[PDB]
C-alpha cells in the first residue's frame, strides 16, 4: 503493498493550524497545503498496525497555511476552512479536495480562524492588525469588526452562545466580544502578561461544574480559568518545572514555550495542556489551589514529544476511542488515548526538501533520507507493526543533507554530504556523533560512492573501500574512512598522471562505480561521461551524448537473467532526454587508447525538464525509473524504449528515486515538496509524463 506518504511538517507557531472531526479525520497545515489523515477503523489497517492513513491533501494556497478549522456540524464534517499568508480564507470540501468558495477580505497577515460551533456556515478570522472578519460562506455575507489595535494570536467561538467569541492577543489581552453588537467587548479578562496561545471554553455551560468558564494559556507559563459571568479569574495554574526525558535534543536550537489547551467534553473537570519540552499534562481542576497534574505517558519512556507542542485536536473514533492528536516542533504528530494517557502512534514528518534516498544492502529495507532540515532520517521500511518507523540523526549534520550512501558491507556505516561541502560518516548503531572529513568541498556535495582505493591511498601501509565525494565545484575526493580527519585526495591528480593529460580536466558533477568495483564513471559539467579502470583510473571510454551537465549515472545490477545487463549504464542530465549505453564491448576489449562513443544504446524521451536521478529495478531486466523537475517519476522498459508508468503524486520537483528492495511494484521518491512517497507501479494510470 500500500502507498505511504512521509509528509511535510505541521506548521509551527500557529494557534490553530490543525483540527479533527469524529470517525474520523485529522487535518494539518504543512507549508502551503493541508494534509489529511484518516484515523480509526476507516483507515483499514491490519490489527496491531496503527489505524491511520495519510489519504489526501488540500492544494491551492500559494503561501504558508496559517489556520485550519473543520466544521463540527453533523452532516458537514467534510467541510473545513483555511487561512493563509496569501491573503485568502478558503472553504473546502474534503470529499472532493476542492474549494467551495473563498474570500480575500483581509488586508493584513491573517493570524487564525475558527468555524463556529453554533452557526453552520460562520467562519471567524482575525489578523495581525486586529481586524476580524465574520464570514457566512453559504449566504454570501460578511462583516468586519475591529476590537482593539493589537495583534491577534488566537480566537475561539463559544460552543454555547452563537454571538460570543474569545480573542487573545500578542500582548496578553483577552476579550470576549459579541459579534451581533459590532464586536462590543463584553468581558475584558486581565491577568496575562505575554502572548496568548490558546483559548478553550468549558464544554459544559454554567459555572456550577468546577454563565460559562473559559481557559487561557500563555507564553507567561500560566493557564487561567475565568468566570465569563463575572469577567474575573477563578483559578491560576502555573506550569511545573520538570526534568527532560527521552533522547537528547540539539541544545543550539532556539525554543520558547507554546502553551496550548484542550478541554475534554467527557471529562469537564479536567484540562489538558502542553508544557516545556512538549510534555502534555492533564490538570485536575477540582483541586484548583493544589495544582494537581498528571504527565501523559508517565509510566513509559521514549513516547513523549521532545520539543514544544503547538496544537491539540480531539478525535472520537467510530469504535469509540477518545483520541487526541498533538503537533510539535519535534516534527512528529502523536496520537494519544485520553482514557489511558498513552501514546497510540507517531507519524514523523519532514521540514525540508528530500534530497537523497539510499537503501542499505546490509539491513534490507533500511532507507536513509537526506533532508533540508538538518536531520538524516532512517526509515525501517520493513517494520512489521509500524508503517512509519523513522529514527532521526542530528548530531554533526547542522545543514542540508544533499547526499547519502550506506557502506556496502559494514552495518550502520552511513556516509553523508551537505550543502556546505561537508562529508561525514555516521555509525547509526551508536549514539555517537559522526566523524567529519577535515577536507570540505567548496560547494554542495552532490554524490557519495564507495569504491576500491586508488593511489596514493591504495599504496600506503588501508580499508577495503574508500569513500568518494563529488562537490558542485567539480572535484572528486577520495577519503580514507579510517583517517577522516587526515588527508583526502583529489583524484584528478591521478587521472592526469595516469592518462598523460595536458589540458584542464573537466568539472565532475557525478560519480558512479560499477557494481563489480572495477570501473568508475564520472559525469561532467559539459555533458561527457568518462569511464575509468582500476587500479590507476586509466581512461578507456568517453561518452559524448548529453549536451548539458550530468546529474545521475546508474549501472544495471548483476543479478539479471543475462550477465551482459551489468554493462548497461543509464544517465540523466539537465536536458530531459535519458540515455542508456552498453559498455560491454569497450570494457571487455580493455583498449590501450580510449574509445569515444557518440550514439546511445537506447534513448528514453518523454520528460519535459531536467533529470535528477535514475535507478534500475533490482527485480527486473532493464527496467528504469527516472525522477524529474517536471514533477513526475517515470518507469521505463529501457530495453524496448517503452514508457510504462508515470507517478504524479508529488507537487514538487523530484530530486531522488529508489526501488523498494523486496517489492517489484514499489518505488520511493523524494522532492522539493518536503515529501517522500512510496507508490505502486500497478496503481499508476498514466503511462508517460504530461506533454
Ligand atoms: Na485582501
Ligand atoms: Na503532481
Swiss-Prot record:
Q: What is the effect of changing residue 653 to A?
A: Abolishes interaction with the isolated 7-methylguanosine cap that is normally part of RNA molecules
Residues carrying the site annotation Interaction with U4 snRNA: 31, 256, 307, 331, 353, 394, 398, 442, 525, 548
Q: Where are the WD repeats?
A: 60-102, 105-146, 148-187, 191-236, 252-293, 305-346, 349-389, 396-436, 440-478, 502-542, 545-591, 606-646, 649-689
Which residues of this protein are annotated with the site description Interaction with U4 snRNA and with the 7-methylguanosine cap of RNA molecules?
446, 610, 629, 653
Which residues, renumbered to this chain, carry the PTM Phosphoserine? 46, 593
What result follows from mutating residue 610 to A? Abolishes interaction with the isolated 7-methylguanosine cap that is normally part of RNA molecules
Location of Phosphothreonine modifications: 49
Location of region: Interaction with U4 snRNA: 11-13
Q: What does the annotation give as the result of altering residue 103 to R?
A: In NEDCAM; uncertain significance
Q: Where in the cell is it found?
A: Nucleus, Nucleoplasm; Nucleus, Gem; Cytoplasm
Q: What is the effect of changing residue 353 to D?
A: Abolishes interaction with U4 snRNA
Q: Where is this region: Important for interaction with U1 snRNA?
A: 1-122
> Altering residue 13 to A: what's the impact?
Abolishes interaction with U4 snRNA. No effect on interaction with the isolated 7-methylguanosine cap that is normally part of RNA molecules. No effect on interaction with 80S ribosomes
Q: What is the effect of changing residue 307 to E?
A: Abolishes interaction with U4 snRNA
The text the record gives for the protein's domains is: The WD repeat domain mediates binding to U1 snRNA and to U4 snRNA. The WD repeat domain also mediates binding to the 7-methylguanosine cap that is found both on mRNA and snRNA molecules. The regions that bind snRNA molecules and the isolated 7-methylguanosine cap overlap at least partially. Besides, the WD repeat domain mediates interaction with the 60S large ribosomal subunit.
- Which disease relates to this protein according to its record? Neurodevelopmental disorder with cerebellar atrophy and motor dysfunction: An autosomal recessive disorder characterized by global developmental delay with predominantly motor abnormalities, axial hypotonia with decreased or absent reflexes, gait ataxia and appendicular spasticity. Affected individuals have cognitive impairment and speech delay. Brain imaging shows cerebellar atrophy.
What biological function has been recorded for the protein in this entry?
Answer: The SMN complex catalyzes the assembly of small nuclear ribonucleoproteins (snRNPs), the building blocks of the spliceosome, and thereby plays an important role in the splicing of cellular pre-mRNAs. Most spliceosomal snRNPs contain a common set of Sm proteins SNRPB, SNRPD1, SNRPD2, SNRPD3, SNRPE, SNRPF and SNRPG that assemble in a heptameric protein ring on the Sm site of the small nuclear RNA to form the core snRNP (Sm core).
**Per the similarity annotation, which family is this?**
Belongs to the WD repeat gemin-5 family.
| Assembly information from the UniProt record | Part of the core SMN complex that contains SMN1, GEMIN2/SIP1, DDX20/GEMIN3, GEMIN4, GEMIN5, GEMIN6, GEMIN7, GEMIN8 and STRAP/UNRIP. Part of the SMN-Sm complex that contains SMN1, GEMIN2/SIP1, DDX20/GEMIN3, GEMIN4, GEMIN5, GEMIN6, GEMIN7, GEMIN8, STRAP/UNRIP and the Sm proteins SNRPB, SNRPD1, SNRPD2, SNRPD3, SNRPE, SNRPF and SNRPG. Interacts with GEMIN2; the interaction is direct. Interacts with SMN1, SNRPB, SNRPD1, SNRPD2, SNRPD3 and SNRPE; the interaction is direct. Interacts with cytosolic DDX20/GEMIN3 and GEMIN4. Interacts with SNRNP70 and HNRNPU.
Q: What is this protein called?
A: Gem-associated protein 5
Q: Gene of origin?
A: GEMIN5
**Shown stretch of the complete protein:** 3 to 722 of 1508
